[PDB]
């Protein structure tokens, strides 16, 4: 059957070329550029003593959770820099963290396959492990909360797992990737989500159906970052090949590619602003570059990090952008 | 200005900062060690005898030094996506069983390739490697009948453990493309009680001394 798959892949490529009547770059020629954009380090979150790999903004645009190799999650009050909570972790090897949309639960994980769930509204006051989600055979990569009861997880098993927090069982298993999954992104309605994989392809999945819907290709190296467009119809990706590509679910094809000759390092994190016109991506050269999602031009550079930009996120309302780095500091722009 | 609730929140944040500083100091005082090697390389027995689904952390103390060993053998994923997490490890413990020279993956070549990749990894440029040659008794018992030439065609001389394990160690060290910046510590493992722990302690002390010397400008 390996002969048929190549022919049908060629057919899909032909169809994608056919539907590509025009390109975003050509049509967006008359669109006025956003101009040169700058953001100042309004807040410098200090208190971490090890590399920071993940962070997530809360639905209120004020509380944000961060994960570092110290084995402790710090909940920061972005408006005052105060540490709302300090959550010791059973394993210091934590690479991902998630903040529940309601703000009642927080999840994290890393080299340990168990995805710890933490409750911030405990009657005891101190944060305790709500439940341990075990069953993965690979290092956990990303976490995203659909609600207080449903969470989608991606790990190095090459399969993304859907977990029911109340029972702790794997509600659904997503399969189809040929490499380790490194990133996750939930749609605005949470019905659909996409995950980046080391196979240089991004696969779209339907939570309700529990199966893949689309697969996107074009990257040359491992995909490390992925984020949905605010409208929920498109998403951007980041990969080690130092290029960021925008894909549309409806078109099932790449819309724009963001890369520069002098940028030789890969992309670790990617996110969209509230309007989606500005694309912010992290890099291994301890700086962040803002790319025009329409004109593909580098609007600005968010410099100030010392070692490496690993995680990046935008508030729910887009008021500010918080970018983590390996120097154990998170800067809010 | 800050209100009463804001002042209390600030005080709580400062207390959390104090706790974080204490935890970071405790982590700094304790030594972090990374474990690598094949499943049958004896690393399992090494971890079992040094204990005084995913990664396993083995915390133990010896002569006032708190040692925590990380076993990443259970991670069946490409290292480069997560190997960077161990950039700050003081030393890396690599376990190789000398009896694999005649095994079938030639898994000795696979172990050599893994050692080469780890040693020349850009994250471990300044990280020393503590090489553990395991199952030396079986290696010497079997070499007298099975020559070492199976794995190393270039090997010459008598086939005895004394001049065979040393040759294996030299071949392993030949993979060093950056001998100037990093160092390798090699030990021979037996059915000991604490000699391996003693060697680990000595290697950690030597690494600390070398780091201090480099900070002084020497070495």
């Amino acid at each position: 059957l390996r002969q048929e798959a190549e022919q049908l892949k060629n057919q899909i490529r032909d169809a994608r070329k056919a539907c590509a009547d025009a390109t975003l770059s050509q049509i967006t020629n008359n669109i006025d550029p956003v101009g040169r954009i700058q953001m100042r380090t309004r807040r410098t979150l200090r208190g971490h003593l090890a590399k920071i790999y993940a962070m997530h903004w809360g639905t209120d645009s004020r509380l944000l959770v961060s994960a570092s190799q110290d084995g402790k999650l710090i909940i920061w009050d972005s408006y005052t820099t105060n540490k709302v909570h300090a959550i010791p972790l059973r394993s210091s090897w934590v690479m991902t963290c998630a903040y529940a949309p309601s703000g009642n639960y927080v999840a994290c994980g890393g080299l340990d396959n168990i995805c710890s769930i933490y409750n911030l509204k405990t009657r005891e006051g101190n944060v305790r492990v709500s439940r341990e989600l075990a069953g993965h055979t690979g290092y956990l990569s990303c976490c995203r909360f659909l609600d207080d009861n449903q969470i989608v997880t991606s790990s190095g098993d090459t399969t993304c797992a859907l977990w029911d927090i109340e029972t702790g069982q794997q509600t659904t298993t997503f399969t189809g990737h040929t490499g380790d999954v490194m990133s996750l992104s939930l749609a605005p309605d949470t019905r659909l989500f996409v995950s980046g994989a080391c196979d240089a392809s991004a696969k779209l999945w339907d939570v309700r159906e529990g199966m893949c819907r689309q697969t996107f290709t074009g990257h040359e190296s491992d995909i490390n970052a992925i984020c949905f467009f605010p409208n929920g119809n498109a998403f951007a990706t980041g990969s080690d090949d130092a290029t960021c590509r925008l894909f549309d679910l409806r078109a099932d094809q790449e819309l724009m590619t963001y890369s520069h000759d002098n940028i030789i390092c890969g992309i670790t994190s990617v996110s969209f602003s509230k309007s989606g016109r500005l694309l912010l991506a992290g890099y291994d050269d301890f700086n962040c570059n803002v790319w025009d999602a329409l004109k593909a031009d580098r609007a600005g550079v968010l410099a100030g990090h010392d070692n490496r930009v690993s995680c990046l996120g935008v508030t729910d309302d887009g008021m500010a952008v918080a970018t983590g780095s390996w120097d154990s500091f998170l800067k809010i722009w | 200005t800050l209100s009463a609730e804001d002042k209390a929140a600030v005080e709580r944040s400062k207390m959390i900062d104090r706790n974080l500083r204490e935890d970071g100091e405790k982590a700094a005082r304790e030594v972090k060690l990374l474990l690598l090697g094949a499943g049958e390389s004896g690393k399992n027995t090494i971890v079992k005898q040094m204990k005084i689904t995913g990664i396993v952390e083995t915390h133990f103390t010896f002569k006032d030094l708190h040692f925590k060993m990380f076993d990443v053998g259970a991670q069946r994923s490409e290292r480069k996506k997560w190997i960077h997490c161990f950039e700050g490890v003081t030393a890396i413990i690599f376990c190789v069983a000398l009896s694999d020279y005649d095994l079938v993956l030639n898994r000795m070549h696979a172990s050599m390739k893994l050692f080469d990749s780890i040693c020349n990894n850009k994250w471990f440029t300044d990280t020393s490697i503590i090489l553990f040659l395991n199952k030396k008794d079986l290696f010497e018992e079997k070499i007298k009948k099975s020559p070492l030439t199976i794995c190393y065609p270039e090997y010459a001389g008598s086939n005895t453990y004394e001049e065979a394990a040393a040759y294996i160690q030299c071949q392993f060290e030949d993979l060093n493309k950056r001998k100037d910046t990093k160092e390798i510590y090699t030990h021979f493992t037996c059915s000991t009680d604490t000699k391996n722990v003693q060697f680990v302690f000595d290697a950690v002390t030597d690494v600390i001394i070398k780091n201090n010397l480099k900070d002084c400008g020497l070495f």
Partner: single-chain antibody
Amino acid sequence: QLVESGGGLVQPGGSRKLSCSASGFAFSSFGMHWVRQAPEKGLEWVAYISSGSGTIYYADTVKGRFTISRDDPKNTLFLQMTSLRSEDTAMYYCVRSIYYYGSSPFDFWGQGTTLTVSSSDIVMTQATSSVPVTPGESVSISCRSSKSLLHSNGNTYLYWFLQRPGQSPQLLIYRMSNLASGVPDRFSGSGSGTAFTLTISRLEAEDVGVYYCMQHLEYPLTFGAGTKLE
């Protein structure tokens, strides 16, 4: 839960140690307040100690005479009382509180102990002394303060407490907008500067009690005269 011990009869000018044992929660990270209620009057804040004993405050009426200390290993809170006056007679309540964004200070109140003896603060006003009520009838309680509680940060620091007969006061609404955990969604609070109100819709059983409005702008903390529902 919080339980208090050390009450009894004390002659005027004497000393009596008051202790509060804490269990079922991380007492170390919870701030502690002492509130006394006279047998025929409303609540009155006594002293406050922050987590770790880093900050300690006392009311002007008990400044110096009363000392508040904590002992984390035993999860016990102590209040050294000396030179007691006649007016000091009241039932002391052990209050649990934690301060962080989105927190609910004064969420839990201890059972309390009865103490009897032989013989520029913010003013909180509750003109609605009493309002006879029956099940199925909506209720509105108005509380007034001499200072605007709308802080520059945007948070309105107002707290509502309901004290059923024979039971210690329980947090009802904190910051005028957030309902305490476990409180039914029936209760609601809203208002503007210098004027606050508490509204209860479709009252029914287990609603009879005294409602106290408290301000948390700065110490010393003050409580209103109290609105009695019957």
